[PDB]
A paper describes a structure:
The Vtc4p β-tunnel domain is not unique to eukaryotic polyP polymerases but is a structural hallmark of triphosphate tunnel metalloenzymes (TTMs), whose characteristic features are the presence of a topologically closed hydrophilic β-barrel, the preference for triphosphate-containing substrates, and for a divalent metal co-factor (PFAM families CYTH and VTC). Members of the ancient triphosphate tunnel metalloenzyme family can be found in all kingdoms of life. Our comparative analysis defines that most of these enzymes share a common catalytic mechanism in their tunnel centers, yet they have evolved different substrate recognition modes on their tunnel entries. The observed substrate plasticity apparently allows TTM proteins to act on a wide array of enzyme substrates and to perform very different reactions, many of which likely remain to be discovered.
Residue numbers in the entry: 4 to 131, 141 to 215
Write the structure that this text describes.
Amino acid sequence: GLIEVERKFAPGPDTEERLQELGATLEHRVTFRDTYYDTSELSLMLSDHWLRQREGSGWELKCPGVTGVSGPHNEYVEVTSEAAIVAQLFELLGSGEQKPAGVAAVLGSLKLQEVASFITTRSSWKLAQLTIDLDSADFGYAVGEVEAMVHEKAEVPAALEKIITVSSMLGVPAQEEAPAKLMVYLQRFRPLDYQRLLEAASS
Ligand SMILES: Cc1ncc(C[n+]2csc(CCOP(=O)(O)OP(=O)(O)OP(=O)(O)O)c2C)c(N)n1
């Protein structure tokens, strides 16, 4: 799959106006459920893999990036082929000897269960490209991301530059590193999982 490069930010009262003034256009709005899966030991998340089923899109696996871009920014390979997702799940959790099947069909054999499920309403903008998604979660939390998707690693630096420039033109504090919706959900509603992630990040 493709390499996603992103920077999250806290959206302000002026964000639409600022986007308008930059020449970004609002492409669509959409409301949808995401459901994230892991083992009881959080084997995926602790290895920086994120498996989800998204209403309207199907199964998606985020795999850790190949280049060094972490900080307020981050980089993931997004895998959307179910066959590719299963192949990676077998390697991480099970055996490559297992019979391939759809992601839903293998969950039970790999002891994968729902760790999080929540609805989001997303207002999606395009800049000529970059995408800027302004999200509101159904547990009460709002976040934005400036994002680019590239094919090869050598395109990452140039994408990363635009992402920073656009966040800055939005007037988003440089220091700010707004958390992912999933991380706020885990903090509020899966506190023992959240602590496990904390203890592993400081390690
Ligand atoms: C402290 C910390 N923060 C973030 C991460 C990375 N991370 C946390 S959750 C998580 C999975 C959810 O990522 P997210 O960017 O919030 O998805 P979303 O915006 O809704 O959808 P999309 O852009 O595909 O449409 C990742 C990759 C990490 N490992 N540690």
